[PDB]
């Protein structure tokens, strides 16, 4: 029996793809990592293909559900997961076929830029977006899609292009988070949306990963500044975790994967640069354990 | 028959002065640019003189209109156009008389600092500024006046002073834009004010132009970050343009000139630094075509 | 007759400790400064000890007042003064006993991190913090505690750790000030709270002092950017001062000490780096005169 695939589900391959790329950067330090990087990679791409097929199905037979998602001042943001993961799969495929990889990366970059130009600017005409629309998911089209373009174009050798996209993501981040934290302080989020709190972890770590990708792994003052703020939000989120899962654990916690994987990626670069190697090992293992718990609970839900 | 000159009209020489200075930086790459730079320069200064005279007239015979502008939590910002363009005319005059140029630049810097100290701080006593007061024009006294002081003082050799003013402008920018974008998302702007959306283009490009002026044209990571965010807002604004001019074209679109000219200026520096030369040429030509359309429509309105 | 010590009173040794450390950095330029640095230092530590004892008393016999402070979405922030000054006293003691100094600095760092993880994140569950809770004092646990950890750990040789804490403070600063200034524009502050406006001066100068502490006194572009924004807020505050003390002078003005002392500290580094030496001397003297007026009025209040 057919069914419209919920767009949020792209968060699953996203996380897994990100984790692949983290292990991929351990290769020259520990060659066995390459094996791990391949397995995650293949799995992430399999799911991605399947999900793309399902979403194409949803575009033909449930198109009005997609349109309603697209016009919502909140739900549209999850549409951005599609180009994002498309770019990440591109990065994975680069290790085997740089030509398919570049095609995918350009599809994802052009698509996310076009999505945000169409929709996020249109938010500025007012009267649709409301105060209660201020959701962490807004980071996906505004910030994460940009950081992913930046690292992917860097992967292809377009470093200055990557810098333009990186600046767009970083300043969009700093421009949106103030009002998001203020809204969280005043109204916060209903249990149905609380799992979305995990995206709050993402901006600093995704930022630093894209920055280190474009600047050839140079762990400078900026990268440490970013890492400090990221660990601050990590601690806040750890303290908040009981409240976030107050109504029970659920697949929505895949929202943390993006931050967790990015932490692991950044950890790798901090480890090559010989900066805070102990914190790096801790971060790398902790994000891997957390994404492993997520995969275990997702298999338990699927097989039951 | 006398008439009080609307303060917004200083936007016209402002734009033209900025465009002059952009072409001025092409001189060592294409000497013919110097000719263009002179013509724009002279025209910008002519208008400036005329406008200053009119505004002096308005200060003597319509003073209460100026006072009402000054006390408004929205309209006061356009007063800042006067020192800003005063500084820009100073920069133009530097090519011929550095002494008049320095006098003008100090007048403009002291005047804008004194204006903002008097008025913007007073906003913090509450009860006059309202949520509906959150207008893009607030960037003029808070951000642009500062960036203009920074580049002008740099022009005079006061680089560290210029850096103080640059930091004031950049952090004021980052501190105000979050709530401005949130307000645009929720309420946006009535057609009477929509042309003011063009000032949203300005901060990143004016920032980067002032930064490159103070740092001797060094196109570094910061300048590329700024350029990326500026092009993001440019694209948003292009998408929004039909809505902005929904009630018809009008002289208010001169609000875009400041961003457009600044883009052209930054383009010049990016071209000397051999960074994204294709994007630079595109930006330079596009801003020149847009300001040319503005001059053509302003002549059509004046001669009809 | 016993009495619960008001937590805000830690602002007094804080300021004095900060001023000590400012003079301490003049030593190699003017050895007499070391004498001044010692006197302030000893006084700051005496008060600190006394205040700690009183607060321990308040914890045993007035515990419910402390708990009510802790649960308030506004008043909790002053609790952060305790670790902050604890760290500052640690820094002073370093000149004589590095072992006690390190113990104090770790107590203060662990304590402030734990305080903010417990309480500031909990703000994000909503419904307690209100729009009217947006107070400048929020900078203490969010921003200043972090900058103080950063400089203290640097003092101990943990420069990369210090950078993590510095980034947390700087991005927390930039993330909170937008909504604070917007709230000040719209509602501002009742006379009972107006003295708290002095904390608005603090972020940029405390930031730059921590940054120069961690980066070995290198006065670079960032430090000048910060100094420019700090002087902008200084001027705004000077203009606002009559309104701030509209209902009369009071001990609450010690809220300015933290910014003033930090200005003096930054001035020292700017003077060693040979950057804006005239502005540096002015800043150093002006903050010293202002904290001296504060000490004089506090003695007049105590002896009367
Ligand atoms: C579904 C994702 C694409 C599948 C392509 C798998 C290619 C198998 O790649 C394997 O790993 C090594 C290094 O990665 C390669 O050198 C070899 O091709 C093979 O050992
Ligand atoms: C990934 C989502 C892309 C599709 C987003 C849907 C946006 C289209 O929007 C809709 O398109 C219709 C076409 O008939 C028009 O009739 C409607 O006016 C318009 O609202
Ligand atoms: C949120 C904004 C943070 C920007 C961080 C900018 C830090 C770049 O600062 C650099 O650090 C080096 C220290 O090793 C110095 O040698 C360089 O002169 C300095 O430019
Ligand atoms: C990304 C989220 C971090 C992992 C969530 C761990 C759950 C934290 O809270 C849980 O309850 C108690 C602590 O509160 C402890 O008994 C458990 O260790 C922990 O599982
Ligand atoms: C990345 C975070 C999701 C992976 C699983 C984290 C573990 C959550 O485990 C937590 O343990 C508690 C008992 O200690 C339970 O009461 C909570 O419901 C449960 O969330
Ligand atoms: C109204 C603005 C001031 C007018 C001064 C015009 C000076 C004419 O300047 C012209 O351009 C050359 C380079 O710019 C100069 O070397 C020469 O003076 C002349 O060729
Ligand atoms: C460029 C605009 C500068 C002028 C701004 C007007 C600010 C003066 O403000 C007005 O000045 C009057 C002087 O009689 C006083 O009576 C009023 O109290 C005061 O509101
Ligand atoms: C919004 C804040 C962005 C600040 C950008 C800071 C970037 C300065 O970063 C500099 O980039 C160079 C790469 O060429 C490195 O060699 C330097 O070590 C590094 O300090
Ligand atoms: C700074 C503003 C950018 C220039 C405004 C160009 C007007 C964009 O929209 C106009 O309508 C249609 C596109 O929507 C096209 O037919 C036209 O090319 C264009 O003139
Ligand atoms: C800098 C932007 C102002 C200069 C003029 C931009 C051109 C705007 O041209 C646009 O073309 C459309 C038809 O294509 C018309 O419907 C719009 O009313 C008109 O704004
Ligand atoms: C209450 C704070 C601790 C008191 C310790 C005071 C130690 C007195 O220190 C004095 O200053 C000199 C440099 O500072 C030291 O070399 C000498 O110990 C002494 O001259
Ligand atoms: C420096 C301030 C530290 C103390 C903050 C008080 C936070 C404790 O909080 C209180 O503790 C009580 C313990 O009996 C509990 O019964 C209450 O549920 C709880 O609100
Ligand atoms: C608010 C964010 C401001 C960040 C300031 C970053 C400035 C670092 O910029 C540095 O300045 C030097 C100029 O001496 C250049 O030589 C370096 O290449 C450049 O990286
Ligand atoms: C940190 C606060 C700065 C010092 C406060 C100085 C008081 C400013 O205002 C006071 O009133 C008049 C100016 O308005 C003048 O007569 C006085 O010089 C000044 O004392
Ligand atoms: C750091 C700021 C506090 C130290 C004292 C600053 C001096 C404030 O002096 C001011 O002078 C005015 C008269 O000129 C009085 O009317 C004000 O009440 C008084 O605040
Ligand atoms: Cl579930
Ligand atoms: Cl470590
Ligand atoms: Cl018109
Ligand atoms: Cl190019
Ligand atoms: Cl008092
Ligand atoms: Cl100086
Ligand atoms: Na707000």
Author numbering:
A (entry chain A), B (entry chain A), C (entry chain A): 5 to 308
Quote what the paper states about this structure.
TehA is an uncharacterized candidate for an ion channel as it is a bacterial homolog of the plant nitrate/chloride channel SLAC1. TehA consists of 314 residues, including 1 cysteine and 10 me­thio­nines. The calculated Bijvoet difference ratio is 1.8% at 5 keV. To remove statistically incompatible crystals, we performed crystal rejection. After rejection of 5 crystals out of 23, the 18-crystal dataset showed excellent CC1/2 and R split values, indicating high data quality [Figs. 4(a) and 4(b)]. BUCCANEER was able to build 300 out of 314 residues automatically. The refined structure has an R/R free of 0.17/0.22, indicating high map quality [Fig. 5(c)]. The f″ values of peaks 9 and 10 were very close to the calculated f″ values of Cl− and Zn2+ at 5 keV. The anomalous peaks 9 and 10 are coordinated by a nearby nitro­gen atom of the main chain or a Lys residue within a 3.2 Å distance [Figs. 7(a) and 7(b)], revealing that the two peaks should come from Cl− but not Zn2+. Interestingly, Na+ is located on the threefold axis of the TehA trimer, suggesting that Na+ may possibly be involved in TehA function.
